[PDB]
Design a protein around this nucleic acid. Structure first.
Ligand SMILES: Nc1ncnc2c1ncn2[C@@H]1O[C@H](COP(=O)(O)OP(=O)(O)NP(=O)(O)O)[C@@H](O)[C@H]1O
Ligand SMILES: Nc1ncnc2c1ncn2[C@@H]1O[C@H](COP(=O)(O)OP(=O)(O)NP(=O)(O)O)[C@@H](O)[C@H]1O
Ligand SMILES: [Mg+2]
Ligand SMILES: [Mg+2]
Ligand SMILES: [Zn+2]
Ligand SMILES: [Zn+2]
Ligand SMILES: [Zn+2]
Lengths: 41, 193, 157, 341, 175, 154, 340
DNA sequence: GGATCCGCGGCAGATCTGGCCTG
DNA sequence: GGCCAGATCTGCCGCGGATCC
């Protein structure tokens, strides 16, 4: 999935943790929104 | 990152594996620490180059037949021995098409020889067809190809494969002789009896 | 500097990163706003009938599929892996008993973890994949229990 | 700093599901052999502390694995800690992945008060020196490295002296390279530490308290070593260095291991622990969690009232005993279950 | 000669040990003595004092690619049959075929009623050998059995290959 | 067999080996019989005439105007491999610790004293343990008694 | 046996003139730092007990201390006096100077202090020393046997460590002493245990017992012979009575790893009471019992049981922060003792 | 009053549990 | 897997207090 790979790649800026976190954020919309807000913040 | 086929598996005594692959850009040899045979794979090489990542793109399930496996190994070895970098962009699609044909068609020998003749033509080893072909040249010596065999060979060498199939629906012996004359003996030639 | 506190808490909450790792990441991202903005601009770039997560009420499995085959999956990562596999045309525990209606064979796609073992024992047509040896590699790079089970699971052909 | 939830499975004789202490002063009440000490020890071990008991004796009789789980939130953010006690050994999972025990050393943590401190105050010279070393070692690792190097050098020189002769000045310089640093660090720490202890103890009793550290080698290790060659030759051992210092606690200008009663010694131990808590809280910015066991057993009414007054101003604390302090939330322990009315 | 021999062993430790051996003649002589002392059973193929192993001095038979595999199997403990040790596997690329294997030695030990475990490699070549031997046995009137394909113990689904999973599915068993 | 037992004993006795590793290598050599005699023949260079180091030939490459002193050949090769500098190289018998009885006599300090001629600088490349520091102090004192400017790595 | 009267002068912070305890159970009540422990310690010393440095028992800025006690036993009353200072103790019995070994024969008293817990929760050495002194309090041969065994073992170890020589007589002496020490220890422990079990059963609900581990249970000579190689390798004797272990058991489990504070305190009190009962049955009349800080770390039931058990003794004195109910009480304020 | 002995605080050296890094 | 850090356990030496002649 494109957004998944984009997330794993941004997190890579190991791959297994990058993947685990991308999956978690995909499965936790609220937490991912809060993280995007804090990053904008 | 590169995309290619698996045509060589040499086990290494230290538990590693020697891999031989060909891409549309040319053949190569690679090694792996500690991907099955005849699989179209996309792989990333690091540098003999050491493979790092591999992605499977398809499996040919029907190759497990003994005779079919032997013919596929023959075709792959001939392709690798003819796998020049300049001809690689031509041979690679021909390789894939021949493998698909030998996987799907009821008689593997038909698409096998169909792909092999075209690979020989495109690899700079095109025989001179101008009834028995000797060292790639017709004459009274060599394997008796016959008028029908000569006509089918000319049609395959000149017409595209779509209408070349009906013509070919013994040339294997002539192709093997020509390849042996051009490049020398074949390791896999012992299997067929 | 009070703004960074919420960011540190947010990165701390996710598993696999400690509070000091989160603080280090925040500090590294504080003076590297180039890739912080790149990540922010790159960020943008489950149905009851299945249990599959997808945009829209109906998943792509619901959206050419059969209801005859239903497989229970432990995690959605395995669901994505099997979607990349594509060997079942069918649709994709405690609630299994009251989902038995409309199901004529039960497919068990759960992993072989001890939790899956206990769940299977509790739940005891139903089918389960076999225990055998993998493909490729070397016989000397295996484990004893797998050897024994393959010897006793030896099939006739 | 604040604790939110604690769960366990097969730890000592405990048998419970969850425990949610309120923010602020708390209490526990129970008879003999119920599990207050077990609960406090479990909390202390879960939050990353060190338990004096052996690892193999922290599980039930018959079982072979134990589980601990705590949920703590700080000024930064919430996180979860989890311990898997078993035959193999301890393992820590911070937020879901394996973590070395040294990583938790940077976390706030907690402090525990027990009669072991009272035993240490009234102990021999070596116990007091070991207590001082362990107390200082929690604020720097350079001190531990210096101690290890000094011990190795001392062993080498003693082995050389015991039999035969060889080059000796080299080991003398090697040992003097570390002795001075150790002495300077101890002096600085004591200078920074004494007034806090004095002002803390001034709010629990009426008398005066202080500290004293006498040194065998004040001017320098080399000068003291060259001035006792005959004694070393006769005895065969080194007789000067930081490994022979003496620490004494004073009540009204007199040693506390010869002219002190039980109540005064207990008050001194509590004051030392509270001063350490305050200093650590200042160091890390967020004060840790305070756990007191047997808060008011061997004390009279006035001292108990003074103790309760001080603990009311702390962020969060938990007291345990056989009686309920007046005016504080109370929970009861009966055979391992904690029920809060 | 030393560097290559040390590297053949399954870098810095190899070198340190070679140096120590150079500085410790006695250990090297003892090792040469043990090697000479060390310098396959006619029927089983395992180790043996002299000619026949203590076991030899049988309705089940296990075909195996190498002696290491035989020993692994015996360590497993779930096999008390006999063995026939081949010289390898078929390989056209290495000129290995019916004229290179011990087929005729195999046929001197086989009987009509028997089961031959097909413990070949899990490759295209090992599978081709398995099928070929099975066909040769069905022609010669003997049962053919094949170990179970499937998932290995302790294996995760995410990291399993698509072929292993497909075989697991196709070969699923009732429960 | 008993030969396998003694081979495993020999392998375990040598440093840097595991008993499980020893057993697995014994089984591997039971599987490979040509590698046995190959190792046997590869098993069968001496002390340098001047320096006394192991030499591929007649002189060690050190001999063939900066001098360094090293505990053992291992750190010698480790330092030379990076190749920051080239100069005369010297190796000691070992460290200097009295717990197991190694004094100055048991070391090769006497040999080092023969060839101070033509030396303008010496650097003491010594390990970070306390024994290394004591050895460095003793060497610095002795050379300063003789008189040579000395340096040590950071 | 009754302690009729007790006087002192310049002893710690005590500032009283006389103290006359009544027969039967009594009590003492005071706050922190008042002088209950000092009074109990003085009473213990006056009757010829054991204790703090001998130079630390004198009041601040003084040099002479005086203690005087008057006891009227069954046969007849007699007096005692003690003088403490720089020279040393001067014990005189009824006007005639005499040594402490004479007072060793008299019954004396038993003191229970918070220092008895370390005999239960302490290391192996402390437990072994406690058992040694407890056995020595009843017999006189034990001390001589222990001293002789210690000297013989020291000589043998010194000879063995420095090279080698002929070791024939030292082994014989060591065996000859160990064979008697072990037998005496077994004989004493065969009788001590039931009294302790009964007393603990009276005090609490669980079960208590003792376990002794012997390295050489059949003979010192054979044990020495069967370990010669490792004895020569290590350089120390590895067998003998000086390596036994004593363990206190609560419900069949070691007490120093599982017991709590209350259980340990109850076990220590039971041990002291068993010793008191054995001494009473041996000498002829029970000694006076002194219990200090009796009821802090115990619940209601344990305190009631302790008080009920102590109610039946010929004489006892209890001290603590809270007055027991239903018994005569005396208060202590700043070193002075006043009674109703 | 001088002198031998007995008992205990204090210290160095050897063992042993549990955590760590390298691979 | 293999090496080290740090707490617990055992025996030897010098010092204080009771006893003797
Ligand atoms: N590993 C264990 N398994 C089971 N029970 C145990 C274990 N360890 C101790 N116990 C029991 O737990 C009780 C002691 O619990 P503890 O937490 O010490 O009590 P406490 O409330 O502090 N009591 P106290 O301090 O004496 O007033 C006793 O009954 C022990 O027998
Ligand atoms: N040698 C001494 N000379 C003068 N005063 C002393 C001396 N020794 C102790 N004290 C005093 O006596 C106090 C100890 O009295 P103590 O008899 O222990 O009290 P207590 O009633 O038992 N107290 P507690 O046990 O704490 O409840 C010390 O704190 C000093 O004030
Ligand atoms: Mg408790
Ligand atoms: Mg007191
Ligand atoms: Zn759906
Ligand atoms: Zn055999
Ligand atoms: Zn040289």
């Amino acid at each position: 999935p494109e957004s998944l790979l984009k997330l794993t790649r941004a997190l890579s800026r190991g791959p297994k943790t990058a993947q685990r976190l991308a999956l978690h954020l995909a499965f936790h919309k609220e937490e991912a929104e809060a993280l995007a807000e804090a990053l904008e913040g | 990152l590169e995309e290619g086929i698996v045509v060589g598996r040499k086990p290494l005594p230290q538990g590693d594996l020697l891999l031989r692959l060909v891409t549309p850009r040319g053949s190569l040899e690679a090694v792996v620490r500690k991907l099955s045979l005849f699989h179209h794979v996309r792989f990333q090489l690091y540098a003999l180059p050491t493979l790092t990542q591999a992605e499977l793109l398809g499996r040919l399930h029907g190759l497990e037949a003994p005779r079919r496996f032997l013919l596929a190994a023959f075709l792959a070895e001939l392709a690798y021995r003819l796998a020049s970098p300049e001809a690689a962009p031509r041979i690679y699609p021909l390789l894939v098409s021949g493998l698909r044909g030998i996987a799907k068609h009821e008689d593997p020998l038909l698409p096998l020889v169909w792909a092999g003749w075209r690979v020989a033509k495109a690899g700079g080893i095109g025989p001179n067809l101008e009834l028995r072909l000797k060292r790639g040249r017709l004459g009274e010596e060599g394997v008796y190809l016959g008028r029908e065999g000569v006509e089918a060979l000319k049609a395959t060498l000149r017409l595209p494969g779509a209408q070349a199939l009906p013509h070919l629906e013994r040339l294997f012996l002539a192709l093997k002789a020509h390849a042996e004359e051009a490049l020398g003996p074949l390791r896999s030639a012992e299997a067929i009896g | 500097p009070e703004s960074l506190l919420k960011l540190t808490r947010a990165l701390s909450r996710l598993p696999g990163i400690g509070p000091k790792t989160a603080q280090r990441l925040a500090l590294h991202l504080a003076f590297h706003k180039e890739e912080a903005e790149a990540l922010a601009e790159a960020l943008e770039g489950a149905c009851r009938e299945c249990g599959n997560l997808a945009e829209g009420e109906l998943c792509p499995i619901c959206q050419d599929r059969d209801r005859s085959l239903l497989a229970v999956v432990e995690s959605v990562a395995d669901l994505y892996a099997l979607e990349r596999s594509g060997e079942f045309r069918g649709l994709y525990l405690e609630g299994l008993f009251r989902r038995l209606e409309g199901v004529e064979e039960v497919v068990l796609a759960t992993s072989m973890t001890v939790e899956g073992e206990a769940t299977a024992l509790y739940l005891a047509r139903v089918t389960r994949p076999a225990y055998g040896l993998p493909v490729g590699g070397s016989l000397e790079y295996a484990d004893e229990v797998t050897l024994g089970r393959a010897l006793e699971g030896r099939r006739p052909v | 700093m604040r604790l939110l939830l604690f769960r366990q499975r097969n730890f000592r004789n405990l048998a419970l599901e969850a425990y949610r202490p309120p923010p602020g002063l708390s209490a526990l009440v129970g008879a003999n052999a119920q599990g207050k000490t077990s609960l406090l020890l479990g909390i202390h071990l879960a939050l990353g502390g060190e338990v004096p008991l052996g690892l193999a004796d922290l599980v039930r009789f018959g079982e072979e694995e134990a589980w601990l789980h705590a949920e703590v939130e700080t000024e930064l953010g919430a996180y979860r800690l989890e311990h898997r006690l078993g035959p193999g050994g301890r393992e820590v999972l911070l937020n879901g992945k394996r973590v070395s025990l040294r990583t938790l050393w940077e976390l706030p943590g907690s402090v525990l008060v027990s009669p072991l401190d009272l035993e240490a105050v009234l102990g021999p010279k070596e116990e007091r020196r070991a207590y001082l070393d362990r107390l200082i070692a929690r604020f720097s690792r350079r001190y531990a490295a210096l101690l290890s190097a000094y011990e190795k050098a001392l062993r080498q020189r003693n082995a050389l002296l015991k039999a035969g002769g060889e080059g000796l000045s080299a080991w003398d310089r090697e040992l003097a390279r570390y002795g001075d640093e150790i002495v300077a660090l101890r002096r600085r720490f004591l200078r920074r530490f004494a007034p806090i202890l004095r002002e803390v103890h001034a709010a629990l009793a009426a008398k005066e308290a202080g500290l004293r550290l006498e040194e065998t080698a004040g001017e320098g290790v080399l000068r003291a070593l060259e001035a006792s060659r005959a004694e070393e030759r006769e005895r065969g051992q080194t007789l000067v260095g930081p490994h022979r210092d003496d620490l004494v606690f004073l009540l009204e200008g007199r040693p506390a291991h010869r002219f002190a009663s039980r109540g005064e010694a207990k008050t001194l131990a509590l004051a030392l622990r509270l001063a350490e808590h305050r200093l650590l809280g200042e160091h890390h910015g967020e004060p840790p969690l305070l756990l007191v066991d047997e808060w008011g057993e061997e004390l009279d009414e006035a001292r108990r009232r003074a103790v309760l007054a001080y603990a009311q101003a702390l962020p969060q604390a938990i007291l345990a005993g056989l009686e309920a302090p007046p005016g504080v939330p109370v929970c009861s322990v009966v055979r391992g279950v904690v029920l809060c009315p």
